[PDB]
Design a protein around this nucleic acid. Structure first.
Ligand SMILES: Nc1ncnc2c1ncn2[C@@H]1O[C@H](COP(=O)(O)OP(=O)(O)NP(=O)(O)O)[C@@H](O)[C@H]1O
Ligand SMILES: Nc1ncnc2c1ncn2[C@@H]1O[C@H](COP(=O)(O)OP(=O)(O)NP(=O)(O)O)[C@@H](O)[C@H]1O
Ligand SMILES: Nc1ncnc2c1ncn2[C@@H]1O[C@H](COP(=O)(O)OP(=O)(O)NP(=O)(O)O)[C@@H](O)[C@H]1O
Ligand SMILES: [Mg+2]
Ligand SMILES: [Mg+2]
Ligand SMILES: [Mg+2]
Lengths: 597, 473, 139
DNA sequence: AAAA
DNA sequence: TTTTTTTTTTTTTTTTTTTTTTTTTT
């Protein structure tokens, strides 16, 4: 217990430490956390952590006698979990509200006192930076971006001028305006305290030829006081303090784990069922967010009832609605997902745009966006050009295709890479080329059937086809249970209302939890016979070879040539090719009568 | 003070001029200091030596205070009158100058001046030159000898580019190693094919010149191709391995005055792979010849000058369909070893069919992001590399894998148009009508383009149209 | 600043707090039928489109332009011979709304089919915040 | 009044 | 066809600082 004497800063840490309640030493699960924090902060002063362990907190009789071996192996702690001394300071602030500030003002006054005493009244662009970092070392953080220029991130606290829904989350600032104000507002009282201390020491008669010393010192400090409000001095202090606030390995850890969502009233965690909202400090790095507040799913809310009834009025089937809701609920997850894509069509004014737009707006701009249909209906562009509207998929969670045309063929090359649990590379305008981890739940909307020219299991492993049944008309007719009356208030309003968005978000997270508890986590486990029956019926069509065999039928060379007339006169015209039919028909039903010779 | 600080921290920092002409700072990373993950014992690029700023503003004060106390001691000693005035003036000037050390512009000027002292010529071009050193998550690994030696202490090799994967010796008793080996065995049924594929993949760690070869292997759905390929590409890391665009291979010439910015994706990259394909893309039989040859290739990146570098990478492509080669010269067919997968995964496996197994989606969705599996796979890779080194010399065109050569020969028999017509519609006089019949048959079938080589009176005729065939005009 | 929050529409000609930056250069006055310009415009409007019911809808359709929120999926196209005043009326609407809120759109957006994903285009970017658009096709 |  | 424009290419630097600074001690 002598290493604490090597530096008073560890003694200030101990002063904060003894404020911690002794109840921490018991109920180990929230005792080992402080050990984790002190260990991952720096391993050089770990013997101070062992000193705290053997410090005799609470009582030695709770199993911690002669130290516990759960500490010895904790010296390694080679993991990725991060808890810093910021949590320790927050916990110390939780208890004894009138002790934290009065115990940190020692230190605040101290460091400035040694700086102003060793170098007389002169103050430069590092002493102020050190004191400022000593004051607010938790609200700010600095890291280098890709381009190599320093950036500033500020933690947001309640009761502060801020944008909507940025609470308890890091914000990106080009210049720390809050810090430029703090350096000139709250530092002034510290300097006034220094001046009054100097005056008090002047008042007491000590001796001759030393009260003169406390006149040169006073004059120098009076000259140096006004330098704070100077613009250039503040800029220099900020430039020098950029190094102190630097936190290595922070940019690449921003918004990484897909189990954290930034919402309008904090950050949402879906790691554990049920999901827990966070409204107190925390330490996880989150920058992107949505402006939608989160409330637990309660069906008694009038908007929840209205939205559930509207959902019931769109999908008549019960298994189909459950499958669709389960698939859509994966949009909140931003990690690796199953290689599946839903495309479904129907008549006009069926409300598909309503549901898709509602999901996109509930998720928000950062997590979801719309995508152009040219990514599907057009061939791949050459490697030299930088592709935009494709890296729009980077970091998103949900994307929907709404535009449609007449009978068009899907480019089944983007499909194999844009529906896949793999990696995709691209390059945006005025930038190099890079590859980004791909996570996105996609859905396609149309009123005309797509064209699929392939038959391999690679493409048909994914894809699920559905057909809308209900139909809205301005003057609905009697009978026709698949016919109903429009409510234009669903599109022109009922979707800008924040409360409806909150209710839909609650429904979506509830469905995610339901999919998590049962059916494990996989989506190829829920039994909805209608969807795969419709998909198989769709796959029965769009398969020209089997239809040709059934409808109309020596040498294998006569094949392809005989299929050409059907291919041109019927089922479109197109241009005839071979070297694929010779393999498909070979691996098909046309074998018993097939003439291999 | 620039001279003094160079004398103080001369063994930890180094400065060299980049291509654009801007001085950059490199520092040696040592244990016990804040750092990014897995960058220990390696040189780290520094835009501004903030560590040097902290050092000059923190530790230099000790030497300055030592000089102050030395001056005080000298003044305190009994002396003459003129000497004491000189020492008083010296102390006054020294403290007035000492006040300047914490200034920002003064520190920037000191850094600017010290840029010259710290400079060491021929450093950027010597970074990551030898391909026998790899930057790993816990140091640097050397494959110079057998077995490989891991360096976890001080050294002097200029290593800057690394991967975030720790290295442990190959232990088959580890549960992760056994699970990975069992999955690998399940992926590839044949023993010889599995050994050949592992030997080919293991060369990806070596970053030097390799033999001109390339592997194409296709299959249906749920074959594990993406799993293995992504596992390799990710365990190597972003710096050493990357994904390649299929259009970079299947397309035509890019215009000479247009920067590529995608060809550089393999500049210094030790491994690259192609994922997707359409129905039938004709292989370019060019723009690949240089990327496979152990030679030099030239291209221009974004907003830079024309540059050339050496081709050093291992290539593999996955497909759901056969490619179109449309060439028969020995140059192209020397490479392109071809394989076909046999295992197939479906959620309802059919009994009595050994070529059928059940999925474990935890192989793709998880078991990849887990660091321990990646460490086990890296151990597998390094063990396979050392095994390929100890026997078979070092050449890879020596391992006996008759399945791969048989499959490559069978694929060569197909896609080859020289005997197709002579077998289906041999006619039996410079074969002008014969070549027109050849072209009209292949059109819309094998070769939709009219034949323009007049090559049927050449090594083509030497292949199958010889003996009875005549060519006198 | 003109406010159409509640009937009758109010003009805020004094200090306020709404964040308004874009504007048109047309002063607003209450609709007085006795103004000579108003009478002339109404007479010309009645001359152009005879049928009362058709005239009503037309004016209402034009009225919707001022609004800049979500509207209904309706598009109007009307044909005729030369010298019919379609250009006069449409240009009048476009000018009275102003550049910031109204613009003329090229017909190539409707004649062609689509540019590929990587083609930076005018791509109806004139529709960003504009509440009115007209084509005047002639082929 | 000259030097810091 | 379509052909090339766009993307690139610059274009975003200067305003402090410095200087001086009268005063102030010598
Ligand atoms: N459950 C519902 N009950 C009554 N009206 C509804 C319901 N759902 C949607 N509507 C209305 O029906 C209309 C259809 O709107 P929309 O979402 O555009 O369908 P749509 O099929 O995607 N449009 P389209 O692309 O032309 O087929 C709108 O006026 C909606 O307000
Ligand atoms: N040895 C194995 N045993 C069981 N399941 C496996 C094995 N290897 C892979 N899988 C699973 O099989 C599924 C297919 O993975 P994937 O590699 O994407 O298929 P693929 O055929 O190689 N890619 P693609 O050809 O485009 O369909 C995944 O869910 C894997 O987790
Ligand atoms: N209400 C009106 N009473 C009398 N003359 C009118 C009236 N409105 C328009 N005109 C005149 O009729 C002309 C024809 O109008 P104009 O807009 O040029 O027709 P247009 O069809 O829109 N253009 P175009 O397609 O080339 O004939 C105008 O130029 C006026 O001179
Ligand atoms: Mg719609
Ligand atoms: Mg795969
Ligand atoms: Mg006209």
């Amino acid at each position: 217990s002598i290493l604490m004497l090597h530096d008073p800063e560890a003694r200030y840490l101990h002063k904060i430490l003894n404020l911690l309640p002794p109840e921490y030493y018991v109920e180990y699960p929230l005792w080992s956390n402080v050990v984790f924090a002190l260990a991952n902060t720096s391993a050089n002063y770990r013997p101070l952590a062992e000193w705290f362990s053997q410090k005799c907190p609470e009582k030695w009789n709770t199993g911690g006698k002669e130290k516990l071996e759960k500490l010895w192996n904790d010296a390694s702690h080679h993991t990725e979990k991060k808890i810093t001394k910021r949590s320790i300071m927050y916990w110390a602030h939780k208890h004894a509200p009138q002790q934290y500030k009065e115990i940190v003002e020692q230190g605040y006054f101290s460091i400035l006192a040694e700086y102003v005493y060793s170098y007389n009244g002169m103050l430069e662009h590092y002493m102020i930076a050190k004191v400022i970092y000593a004051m607010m070392g938790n609200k700010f953080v600095v890291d280098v971006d890709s381009n190599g220029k320093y950036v500033w991130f500020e933690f947001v606290l309640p009761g502060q001028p801020m944008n909507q829904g940025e609470i308890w989350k890091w914000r990106k600032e080009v210049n720390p305006d809050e810090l430029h104000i703090y350096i000139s507002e709250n530092f002034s009282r510290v300097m006034d305290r220094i001046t009054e201390h100097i005056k008090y020491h002047l008042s007491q008669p000590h001796e001759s030829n030393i009260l003169n010393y406390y006149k040169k010192l006073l004059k120098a400090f009076e000259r140096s006081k006004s330098k704070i409000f100077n613009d250039s001095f503040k800029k220099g202090v900020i430039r020098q303090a950029e190094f102190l606030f630097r936190q290595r390995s922070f940019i690449q850890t921003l918004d990484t784990n897909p189990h954290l969502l930034g919402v309008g009233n904090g950050v949402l965690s879906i790691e554990t069922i049920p999901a827990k909202l966070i409204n107190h400090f925390h330490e996880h790095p989150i920058h992107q967010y949505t402006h939608i507040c989160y409330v637990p799913f309660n069906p008694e809310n009038p908007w929840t009832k209205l939205l559930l009834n509207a959902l019931q009025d769109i999908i008549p089937e019960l298994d189909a609605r459950l499958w669709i809701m389960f698939y859509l609920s994966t949009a909140i997850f931003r990690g690796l997902k199953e290689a599946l894509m839903l495309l479904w069509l129907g008549g006009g004014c069926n409300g598909k745009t309503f549901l898709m737009r509602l999901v996109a707006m509930v998720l928000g701009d950062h997590y979801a966006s719309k995508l152009n249909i040219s990514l599907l209906t057009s061939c791949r562009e050459t490697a030299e050009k930088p592709n935009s509207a494709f890296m729009r998929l980077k970091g998103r969670g949900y994307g929907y295709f709404e535009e449609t045309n007449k009978s068009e063929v899907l480019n089944t090359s983007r499909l194999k890479e844009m529906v896949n649990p793999g990696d995709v590379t691209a390059r945006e305008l005025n930038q190099k080329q890079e590859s980004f981890q791909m996570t996105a739940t996609m859905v396609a909307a149309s009123n005309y059937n797509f064209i699929i020219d392939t038959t391999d299991h690679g493409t048909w492993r994914r894809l699920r086809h559905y057909r809308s049944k209900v139909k809205f008309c301005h003057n609905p007719d009697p009978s026709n249970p698949y016919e109903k009356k429009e409510d234009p208030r669903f599109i022109h309003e009922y979707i800008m209302d924040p409360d409806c968005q909150n209710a839909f978000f609650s429904i979506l997270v509830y469905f995610w939890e339901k999919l998590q508890k049962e059916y494990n986590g996989q989506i190829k486990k829920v039994f909805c016979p209608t969807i795969e029956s419709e998909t198989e019926a769709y796959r029965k069509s769009q398969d020209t070879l089997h239809r040709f065999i059934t409808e109309r039928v020596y040498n294998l060379s006569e094949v392809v040539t005989a299929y050409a007339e059907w291919y041109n006169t019927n089922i479109n015209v197109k241009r005839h090719i071979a070297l694929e039919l010779s393999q498909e028909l070979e691996n098909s039903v046309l074998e018993k009568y097939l003439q291999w010779s | 003070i620039a001279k003094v600080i160079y004398a103080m921290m001369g063994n930890k920092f180094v400065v060299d001029v980049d291509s654009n002409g801007k001085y950059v700072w490199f520092e040696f990373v040592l244990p016990g200091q804040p750092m990014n993950q897995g960058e220990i014992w390696k040189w780290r690029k520094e835009v501004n030596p903030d560590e040097l700023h902290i050092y000059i503003s923190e530790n230099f004060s000790r030497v300055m205070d030592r000089i102050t106390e030395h001056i005080k001691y000298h003044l305190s000693q009994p002396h003459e009158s003129n000497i004491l005035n000189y020492y008083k003036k010296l102390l006054k000037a020294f403290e007035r100058s000492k006040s300047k050390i914490f200034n920002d512009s003064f520190k920037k000027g000191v850094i600017r001046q010290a840029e010259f002292l710290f400079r060491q010529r021929s450093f950027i071009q010597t970074l990551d030159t030898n391909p026998h050193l790899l930057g790993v998550g816990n140091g640097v690994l050397s494959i110079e000898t057998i077995p490989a030696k891991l360096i976890n202490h001080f050294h002097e090799h200029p290593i800057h580019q690394y991967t975030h994967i720790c290295y442990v010796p190959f232990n088959p008793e580890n549960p992760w190693t056994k699970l990975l080996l069992n999955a690998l065995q399940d992926i590839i049924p044949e023993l010889d094919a599995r050994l050949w594929i592992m030997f080919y993949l293991s060369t990806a760690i070596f970053r030097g010149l390799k033999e001109a070869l390339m592997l194409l292997w296709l299959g249906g759905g749920c074959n594990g191709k993406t799993f293995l390929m992504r596992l390799v590409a990710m365990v190597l890391g972003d710096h050493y391995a990357s994904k390649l665009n299929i259009s970079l291979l299947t397309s035509c010439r890019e215009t000479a005055e247009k920067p590529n910015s995608a060809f550089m994706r393999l500049k210094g990259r030790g491994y690259g792979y192609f994922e997707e394909t359409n129905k039938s893309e004709v292989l370019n039989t060019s723009r690949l010849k240089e990327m496979v040859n152990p030679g030099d290739v030239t291209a221009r990146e974004l907003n830079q000058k024309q540059e050339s570098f050496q081709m050093t990478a291992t290539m593999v492509a996955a497909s759901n369909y056969n490619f179109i080669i449309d060439t028969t010269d020995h140059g192209t067919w020397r490479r392109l070893r071809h394989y076909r997968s046999k295992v197939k995964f479906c959620h309802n496996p059919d009994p009595s069919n050994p070529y059928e197994k059940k999925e474990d989606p935890r192989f793709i969705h998880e078991y990849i992001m887990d660091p321990d599996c990646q460490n086990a796979f890296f151990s597998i890779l390094v063990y396979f590399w050392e095994k390929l080194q100890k026997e078979y010399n070092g050449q890879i065109k020596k391992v006996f894998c008759p399945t791969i050569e048989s499959e490559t020969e069978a694929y060569r028999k197909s896609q080859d148009t020289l005997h197709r017509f002579i077998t289906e519609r041999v006619v039996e006089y410079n074969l002008s009508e014969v070549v027109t019949a050849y072209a009209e048959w292949y059109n819309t079938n094998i070769n939709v383009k009219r034949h323009i080589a007049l090559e049927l009176s050449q090594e083509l005729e030497n292949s199958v149209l010889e003996k009875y065939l005549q060519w006198s005009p």
